[PDB]
Design a protein around this ligand. Structure first.
Ligand SMILES: [Cl-]
Ligand SMILES: [Cl-]
Ligand SMILES: [Cl-]
Ligand SMILES: [Cl-]
Ligand SMILES: [Cl-]
Ligand SMILES: [Cl-]
Ligand SMILES: [Cl-]
Ligand SMILES: [Cl-]
Ligand SMILES: [Cl-]
Ligand SMILES: [Cl-]
Ligand code: NA
Ligand code: NA
Ligand code: NA
Ligand code: NA
Ligand code: NA
Ligand code: NA
Ligand code: NA
Ligand code: NA
Ligand code: NA
Ligand code: NA
Lengths: 500, 500
């Protein structure tokens, strides 16, 4: 169940007799009230119709009108929210409607609210799929990160949200709500870890977080490998990234065995660069505070595990979090260094700011021992991905078409979308080095793709895919600056489908 | 038939008795000679086997060994070319093999050569598909642009190439060769127009080129509209691009009616910015000579027409070439100008270097009058596409999934590949303007996509797709700097399939 201060219930009772602090109804733009709103209007003797006739609420998506006590209702307030003029909403409009409702309710002193929104239609979504989107939007919309504020906002009075559904849909709605709550809990852990400042959130801290998660979930086993063990394993490019920082690196291994021992596991590999200065290839100063989000890949592995552990899915899951801090220093890796990866391939490190792939490639080699049926790495890897796909769609590459399709489908269902980019063999020659087996960077052309090509050289032994979340893992500026928790919804949906 | 100084023949005779200046045979790396090479070796009494045993030719793809007269052969020379160790070649290896053969033959004084390469296997390609790739690579490999060199290279002695094929395959090979020759002729026209310097290749020159093509092909009708007519049509954003230059703009209309009058036409829309300084939003000086390639979109419409006209395909085809020169001047368009497009939508021109879309959008509105069944615009539009997809894969967007799939399939067959990028509705808000209906640029995120989103607002009335060839239309540096002729092979293959 959701942990962020909200209980979500599903009930099949009549809205017009439900006791609640706020009853929420949808109002169309220039079309008749839906069945639920009409039943409530009838119960009040036409009071809602009479208000709407006065014209303050045009009915555009997300517009609101709040009424107090109406005759013959047990609702203390009635919140009208506009649903536009279309027969069906798209996902974006449904989310906008839900967020407008939540924003209003947050500011009220009501301890609960009941959503009578079952008459809304959303393109391509039945009861379960609508509940997944609605509850995830509501629950994630409650997220707060204020532990470093001396002045904290007043706690919400709102503590309970009831979804009204016809009895024939209530089981699907309940299922969707339960899954959405687990996803939102995972997103909240991901966002917390992403938002923590890098002087607190370093690799050792992430190791202790993993141990704490195992304390909470007896089904989770955790092992944390330090720099001595990494050197024993021959993890040369991983160590090269870490060596310039005072902070020691960590390889965190999470294991959950929800299925029979004969089922091959799915492996999630997360880039956990807790801060990325670029190293000797130093980044510019402007906006470099957002490099604390360079561990959002690893954070999303935490969050996906958190959701899976709550749902107790019948799957075998492994998490590999490759965490290091990338700092300049008198002992840092230099451009031109050549290192031997755990696979034995030598890499010429042309640019020390292309370091995510250097911790990932050793983790991908490590993943071979699990004989996985799928391996997915998640990383804030290339600014080129933002040029290619922006901030709303993650880049996706892989060496197996069926797995890539499974991830695309999961992202569509989750409304946490990705988009495939090709790993054509012609791109690989961009990584040729006169000195070593591989150069760690290509040119300025196709940067997201050549990063995927680099990783692919370590993933040939299994079905593998790669999510570039450089654009989707956080919001850069404004009031809403901070980690997003993506791609936890995509990944959790992928695993939900693999668990059937 | 190919016009660049080469006759291509298909014959089904035995290689070992064929009179030719050079007989070309494939030699595998560490595997037995194929059937054709073995038959020739047997005819010489083992002379080729005996040479190969000495070890000078390892057999790697494209390696060569040239022999002179061998016993009992009518070939004056025998050229051995390595074919690697795989059972089947990929497209890249097949092209590399063919280019190595051609490079050797170019340097010889032989007037002809015979290719006995029928035993080569290429992944996913039968006789017709292999001949398409082989002949197009050979014919396009003969391209020369030397009209501004005072010292021209010696003319080739090689004037005839014979493809040897089994009688059961010879019809397919002949068909593939004929189509490849037409494509190569079209590519040569495209490359010529792209390579011409911008003080020669201006919009008026392109208009005269269209008139010259109609003189050569009686099935082509051409109309050239000048700035007065553009202003009568209300083509405000097109005129805004052109107004800073001394060179007047041209809208060139090509029409070919190869099918019954009841068949809706296919429309190709080409960006013909004959030079792009950026305008007031001036480009940096470094590499700005390659902005003469900013008309390669329009050039590829010329080239696709040239191939279609030679093949006399039973289709109805329209070409719209929107040509202008983008110059700074005391009357040039300024950042912040607002103009009314022919569609009536107003556009705020935030950056005068995003000018390709401003001539294209008026051409897309113009295309409505043809009631087309497909509209494809081709443009060197965004440097962001090179970041996203590099120099080897064109970006593709559209408003119709079936058309996008048809173009992807054509590019795969042609080995002139594209890759779809999404036009999700969420990207559209990047083009919001406080002052006008549309801004002409989004932010630094998803630049290729937001350019496609801008064009999509003018294409809603028909099935439309958009090819960003900023990366594939030319080669930037080195000995091979110059226009490539892409995407003529993709477009011609698309139309070949639509003609069935
Ligand atoms: Cl249901
Ligand atoms: Cl630790
Ligand atoms: Cl340690
Ligand atoms: Cl974006
Ligand atoms: Cl799914
Ligand atoms: Cl055949
Ligand atoms: Cl003209
Ligand atoms: Cl004129
Ligand atoms: Cl490239
Ligand atoms: Cl095709
Ligand atoms: Na609507
Ligand atoms: Na929507
Ligand atoms: Na970096
Ligand atoms: Na990084
Ligand atoms: Na490059
Ligand atoms: Na081979
Ligand atoms: Na190949
Ligand atoms: Na430009
Ligand atoms: Na341009
Ligand atoms: Na942007």
């Amino acid at each position: 169940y959701f942990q962020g201060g909200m209980e979500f219930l599903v009930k099949s009772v009549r809205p017009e007799t439900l006791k609640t602090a706020t009853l929420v109804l949808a109002v169309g733009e220039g079309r008749k009230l839906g069945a639920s709103a009409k039943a409530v209007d009838d119960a009040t003797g036409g009071a809602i119709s009479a208000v709407l006739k006065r014209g303050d609420l045009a009915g555009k998506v997300g517009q609101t009108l709040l009424l107090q006590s109406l005759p013959n209702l047990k609702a203390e307030r009635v919140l009208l929210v506009g649903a536009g003029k279309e027969r069906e909403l798209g996902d974006r409009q449904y989310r906008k409607l839900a967020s407008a409702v939540l924003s209003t309710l947050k500011g009220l002193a009501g301890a609960d609210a009941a959503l009578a929104l079952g008459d809304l239609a959303v393109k391509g979504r039945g009861a379960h799929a609508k509940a997944r989107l609605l509850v995830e939007t509501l629950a994630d919309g409650l997220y707060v990160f204020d532990r470093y504020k001396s002045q904290k906002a007043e706690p919400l009075k709102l503590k309970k949200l009831t979804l009204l559904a016809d009895k024939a849909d209530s089981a699907a709605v309940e299922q969707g709500s339960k899954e959405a709550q687990a996803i939102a809990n995972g997103m909240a852990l991901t966002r917390d870890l992403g938002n923590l400042p890098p002087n607190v959130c370093h690799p050792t801290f992430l190791g202790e977080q993993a141990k704490g998660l195992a304390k909470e979930f007896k089904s989770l086993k955790v092992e944390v490998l330090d720099e001595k063990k990494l050197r024993e394993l021959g993890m040369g490019s991983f160590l090269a990234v870490a060596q310039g920082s005072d902070q020691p690196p960590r390889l965190i291994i999470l294991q959950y065995n929800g299925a029979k021992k004969d089922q091959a596991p799915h492996v999630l590999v997360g880039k956990g660069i807790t801060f990325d200065t670029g190293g000797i290839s130093l980044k510019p100063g402007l906006g470099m505070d957002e490099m604390k989000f360079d561990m959002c890949g690893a954070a999303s592995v935490f969050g996906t595990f958190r959701a899976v552990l709550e749902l107790q899915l019948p799957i075998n899951l492994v998490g590999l979090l490759a965490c290091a801090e990338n700092m300049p220093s008198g002992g840092a890796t230099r451009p031109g260094d050549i290192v031997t990866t755990m696979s034995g391939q030598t890499v010429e490190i042309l640019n020390t700011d292309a370091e995510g792939r250097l911790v990932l490639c050793d983790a991908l080699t490590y993943a071979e021992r699990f004989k996985p049926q799928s391996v997915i790495d998640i990383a804030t890897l290339t600014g080129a991905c933002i040029v290619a796909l922006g901030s709303n769609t993650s880049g996706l590459m892989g060496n197996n078409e069926a797995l890539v399709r499974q991830l695309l489908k999961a992202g569509e269902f989750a409304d946490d979308r990705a988009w495939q980019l090709p790993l054509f063999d012609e791109y690989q020659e961009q990584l040729d080095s006169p000195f070593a087996d591989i150069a760690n960077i290509g040119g300025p052309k196709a940067g997201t793709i050549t990063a995927g090509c680099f990783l692919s050289r370590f993933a040939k032994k299994y079905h593998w895919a790669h999510l570039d979340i450089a654009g989707t893992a956080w919001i850069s500026g404004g009031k809403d600056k901070g980690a997003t928790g993506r791609p936890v919804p995509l990944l959790t949906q992928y695993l939900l489908e693999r668990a059937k």
